[PDB]
Automatic annotation (TrEMBL), chain A:
<protein>
    <submittedName>
        <fullName>VP3</fullName>
    </submittedName>
</protein>
Amino acid sequence: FINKRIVERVRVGQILAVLNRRFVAYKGKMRIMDITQSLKMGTKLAAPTV
Amino acid sequence: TATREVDFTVPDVQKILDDIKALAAEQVYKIVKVPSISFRHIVMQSRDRV
């Protein structure tokens, strides 16, 4: 006994009845990039010497 | 990055400007001595109608 719907006999008329999740996608004309490694890009300032 | 591949090549503006300048010498009209034929006739076995 398992209280889950693993295998179910489904008519052809209700094949597409499982469409209930909202999906968000991005345009192909825009870019997505990861800038995690950009946090360590920097330079130090040396003190003047005489 | 994740985007469509676009080749960021640099063109030369001199040839483009020369082509734009040369485009101003084109002629949209034309000069002819006689107009084109606009009607034709088909004859049949009759001698009074075509």
